[PDB]
Design a protein around this motif. Sequence first.
Motif, mmCIF file in Angstrom:
data_model
loop_
_atom_site.group_PDB
_atom_site.id
_atom_site.type_symbol
_atom_site.label_atom_id
_atom_site.label_comp_id
_atom_site.label_asym_id
_atom_site.label_seq_id
_atom_site.Cartn_x
_atom_site.Cartn_y
_atom_site.Cartn_z
ATOM 1 N N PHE C 76 1.684 -3.725 -0.622
ATOM 2 C CA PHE C 76 1.339 -3.542 0.849
ATOM 3 C C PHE C 76 0.252 -4.699 1.360
ATOM 4 N N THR C 86 -2.469 3.853 8.249
ATOM 5 C CA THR C 86 -1.132 3.041 9.151
ATOM 6 C C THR C 86 0.071 3.679 8.589
ATOM 7 N N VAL C 87 0.213 4.220 7.114
ATOM 8 C CA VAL C 87 1.411 4.781 6.841
ATOM 9 C C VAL C 87 1.554 6.035 7.839
ATOM 10 N N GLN C 89 0.263 6.674 10.813
ATOM 11 C CA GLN C 89 0.643 6.447 11.967
ATOM 12 C C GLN C 89 2.303 5.827 12.224
ATOM 13 N N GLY C 90 2.800 5.353 11.167
ATOM 14 C CA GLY C 90 3.947 5.329 11.056
ATOM 15 C C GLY C 90 4.477 3.740 11.333
ATOM 16 N N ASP C 91 3.374 2.719 11.022
ATOM 17 C CA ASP C 91 3.574 1.292 11.263
ATOM 18 C C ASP C 91 4.170 0.744 10.073
ATOM 19 N N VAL C 92 4.477 1.539 8.873
ATOM 20 C CA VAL C 92 4.888 0.778 7.710
ATOM 21 C C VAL C 92 6.454 1.050 7.545
ATOM 22 N N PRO C 93 7.258 0.281 7.462
ATOM 23 C CA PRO C 93 8.885 0.673 7.495
ATOM 24 C C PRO C 93 9.239 1.198 6.209
ATOM 25 N N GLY C 94 9.929 2.187 6.280
ATOM 26 C CA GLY C 94 10.514 3.067 5.265
ATOM 27 C C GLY C 94 9.701 4.008 4.389
ATOM 28 N N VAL C 95 8.276 3.793 4.473
ATOM 29 C CA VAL C 95 7.501 4.840 3.810
ATOM 30 C C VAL C 95 7.359 6.252 4.302
ATOM 31 N N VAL C 96 7.669 7.444 3.469
ATOM 32 C CA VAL C 96 7.457 8.509 4.140
ATOM 33 C C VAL C 96 6.823 9.638 2.911
#
Lengths: 50, 215, 100, 136
Positions: C76, C86-87, C89-96
Amino acid sequence: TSPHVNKDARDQYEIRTYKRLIDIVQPTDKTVDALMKLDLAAGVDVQIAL
Amino acid sequence: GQKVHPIGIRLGVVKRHNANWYANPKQYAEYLLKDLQVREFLTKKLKNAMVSNILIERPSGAAKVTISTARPGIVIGKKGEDIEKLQRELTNIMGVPAQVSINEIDRPDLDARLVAEAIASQLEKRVMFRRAMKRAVQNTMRAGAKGIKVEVSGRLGGAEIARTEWYREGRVPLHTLRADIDYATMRAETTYGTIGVKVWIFRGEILGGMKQVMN
Amino acid sequence: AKKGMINRELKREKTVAKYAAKRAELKATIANVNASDEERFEAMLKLQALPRNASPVRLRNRCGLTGRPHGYFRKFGLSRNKLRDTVMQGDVPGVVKASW
Amino acid sequence: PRRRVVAAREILPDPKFSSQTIAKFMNHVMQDGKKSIAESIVYGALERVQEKNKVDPVEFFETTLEKVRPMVEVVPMEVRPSRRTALAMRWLVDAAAKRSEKTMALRLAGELLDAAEGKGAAIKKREDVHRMAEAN
RNA sequence: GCAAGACUAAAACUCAAAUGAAUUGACGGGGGCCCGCACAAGCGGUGGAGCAUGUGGUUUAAUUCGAUGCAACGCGAAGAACCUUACCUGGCCUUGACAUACUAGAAACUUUUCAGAGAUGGAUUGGUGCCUUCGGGAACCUAGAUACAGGUGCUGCAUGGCUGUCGUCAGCUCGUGUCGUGAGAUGUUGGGUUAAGUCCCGCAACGAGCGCAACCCUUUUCCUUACUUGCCAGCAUUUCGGAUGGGAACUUUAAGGAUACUGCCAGUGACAAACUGGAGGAAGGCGGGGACGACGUCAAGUCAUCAUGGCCCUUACGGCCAGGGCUACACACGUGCUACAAUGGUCGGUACAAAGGGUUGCUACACAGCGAUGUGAUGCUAAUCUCAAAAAGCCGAUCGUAGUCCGGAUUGGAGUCUGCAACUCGACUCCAUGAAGUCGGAAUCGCUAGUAAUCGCGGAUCAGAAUGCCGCGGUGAAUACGUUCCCG
C-alpha cells in the motif's frame, strides 16, 4: 490499532483476487469486432490472446 | 469500550467501496497514493460546496470522479468553467485523462457528513452546543430518518475540563450488520482548541443482501 | 517525521536515480569473465569511488503521507496508522475485515 | 464443571484384539501422540507373555489387572470402578518403567509375568494402600 | 461527705452551622442464590543449567525517547554494521534542506579534474532549450530583502483522533397510569429455566429503545452450472511417464442453491417454559470456529504516526557531514529456545500434507567443490515452470546405561555470500575443542477434543540479518465425584 503500545490489539484485513478463463472456438468474423466493441467495466481487467 | 467503524464493518456486507479499480501489485501503491492526493485536493477545494461523497474509478487507462453534492450550481460554475478547470487539475494530478461527474443530493438532512459539517460550523461560530445538537437532531428526524445520534467532545463552552455530550432520538441498531447506518466525524477549531463531532444516521434495514446491493 | 528527514530521503532517491546507470555498467564489467583482471580491478576501484548516497541500500521506506519509518507494508505504501484509517473509511479497493 | 454432567469419552476397541482394556492401556503408555511406538510396545509384550506361558493374551492381561487392582483410596470411601482400573494401569506402567532390559516391551512382559505371581512394585504399592487404609 | 466526690451553677472567647427521619448509590474482614480451567480430578510446563530476548541497576563522551500491579518487561520496533537515529565527539551553514509574497539575472542541465574524512570549496567542457497577440512569458536555477520558515523542545493534568481494562460480564434506560408532602418507588419484583433481562407463569400496573440472539465469513452432506493450465472410470497407442488420441464419469477448482425446524416417537415438568431417552439423517437440540464488545470506571496510555490551545529557541533547542553509541557488565527480574537420553542417538533403504511466495524474482538440468556456494543453461508475469527435501512414520544394522556414539556452550584455524564497507557489530559452511547439565526447593502457569503434547512447512518487515510475531497441515491423549474451601 493502538498508536503506542498494545501488541494484542490488531485488525486483520484481507484482499482477494478472482480469476476467470474463457475460450472461444470457431470464431466468426463478427465475433472479434464485437469483442472490442464490448464495454469495459471498472474493477474488472480483461486480457485477450489470439 | 471502543467501537468498530460502522462503515468499515459493513464494507463487504451492505456497503459499497469508495474506490472501484483493479491494479497489479506493482501499480497498486502508486494508484492508491494518487487517489488519496485527489481526495485531499478535492476536499480542500470544495469546502463550501456541500460535498459528502467522492467516488474514484479507473475504467481503462483513464479516471472518473463522481462528486455527490448538494450545491450542483456552485460546483458546476456559471457556464461550466469550474468543471473543465477541475478536469484539468485532476488530469494533471492523476497523470491520465479524468472525467468529472455530478450527483445531486435531494435530501441533505439525511446525509451524515453535511449534518456534522453544519454542527461544526455552528460550534466555530460559538452557538451553544446543546442548542446546535437539538436543532440538528430535530431537523433530521423531521426530514424522515428512523434514528440519529449526535455526539460532541472536548472543551465545551471553553471550560478547562473537557467532556462528552450526546443526544439520540429514534432507533440506532449498531450491532445489525444489515442496517443502513451513515456515519461521519468532523472537527471544530475554536480559540480554545479542537472539538470533535460524531453523527450516526439510520435509514432502515437493507434486505436481499449484497446480491440485492449489486456489488 | 520531520521535514529535514523527508528532504533527506528525497535527496537520496534523486542521487540513486542519477547514478543508477553507471553503477550497473561497472557491476557488469566486474562480472565480465572475458574482461581482464585489470579491467575488473579498476572497475571495482571506480565503484568504490562512487558517492555513498548512490547505493540503494541506504534508502529507507517511509509512509507516503506522514513519513513514518516503521510498519511500511510495501503493497500500500502507507504506514499502519494511515492504512487503518483509510481502510476503515473505505478508500482502499478490495480490502475488508478478515475472518475465517 | 458446576452445572452440567459431562459424559465419559468412549474409546474405540483395539483393531487387533477388539479389547477396550488393551486400547486404554495403549493410551496410558503413549506419549506425545506416538501411537505406533506404544502399539509396538504393547503387542510385543503380549506376544512375549504368550510364549513364556501359553495363555490367551487378553485373559492373562485381565487377570493380572484384577490382581493389581486396588479396592480403596486414601477418610475412607469406595473407589468407583473406572478409577480402580485407571490407577492400576498407572502403577503397572510406572513400575515396569524402572526395570533394566533392552526394550520397553520386554520390561512390560517381564513385570506382567512377575505380577501374575504377586511379585512387583505395583503389588507392593497396593499393599501400602492396604496398610494406610487399615490406618483409617 | 472520712475520702472519692455529689448538688446548685456562669462568663469571656469562637463557628455558621450542629442535629432528626427517610431516599438513591457505593462499600462491608454482613447474610442468601448463581456463574467461570476458580478450585477439585488429570496432562504438560516455569522457578535449577547453557543460550536468545526485554527491563532495572551500574558504567560511559553517549550508552536517544517512551511503556511500570493484574492491564509495563520477544511492548512502540512487521526486523540499529553506514542509512534508520532522534544520542556523543569533532568539522561546517545562517530567510535557511522545505512554503508563500517582492525585486533582478540566467534554460535547466552536462563533461573533466583538484583539495578535503566528508559536508563543502575551486577550476573545467558541451548544451543553452518550449510557447508565443511573439516588446515577454512557462517550468527550472542563481543573487538580494523581510514578513517568516524550522523545532522527535515542554504540557496526555488544556484537547481531537485512536487504544487497553473490568468483560463477551448481563445489564442500562424511557412514556402513560397508581402510592408517597417530598427526593422517589412500581413496572425491571416473586416461582421455574437458560450461554443470556433467553422464555413461560403470578403480580397496580400497562407499554417501548439499546444490550443477548439472528442477519456477515469459514468448516461438515447433497444438487445445478462451468471442463482448462486441473481430472482419468471406459476405449486405443505407448519409450510404461495422462506420455499421446480421446472422455466429461470421479477428485478438485468456485459461483448459485437445498438441508435441521424439538420435524417424528416415548417419558417427564404445570397442565407452560422447558428437560431426558429413541429412530431416521453427513450432522439433533447452541454441530465447530471467527468477526461483531451496551450505559459506564480508571485525570488509564499516546503532544515521538498525525492534528491542535498555550509556553519556549531563532548564528540555534534549526539544518549538513565523518567517526562512535543505542550491542557496555561485579549484579536482579520477566518472556522464550535447546537439553539432561534407550518411548533414544547414528547409519542405509523406503512412504504420506496443507497453506503461501516468485520478473531488481524463483529457477529445471549439467559441470566444479567435503560444504556453504560458483559457472553455463532452461521454464515461468504462473491450477502451465519453480521455491520443494515435508518431518515425526515403517524396515534393517549398531550403540548397552556410561557424563556415554547423550548434550552442544565456548574457543583455535580455514572459508562463502549480501553490501561502498561485516574491527567495534552480520548470517551460513568445513576441521579441531567438547562447558554446565543425572529432571530441578518454597512457590507458580496453560489446557475440557481433533484440545493438550509432539513434528515439520510458509509469510510480513527485509540488500543481508528470527529461538520473536502471524498462519498451515501430520500424529494424536488423560481426567471431570462435585461446589466444602482459593480468586473473580
